[PDB]
C-alpha cells in the first residue's frame with residue numbers, strides 16, 4: 001500500500017501513514 005494519500009490520512013505527514021503513524025489505535 002504505497003503512500004498515495006501523501007502521509008497518514010489523519011495526521012497529515014509523510015514518512016508514515018495512518019497505517020504506520022505512531023497513533024493508529026492497533027487494539
Ligand SMILES: [Zn+2]
Pocket residue numbers: 007008011012013014016017018021022
Ligand atoms: Zn503521520
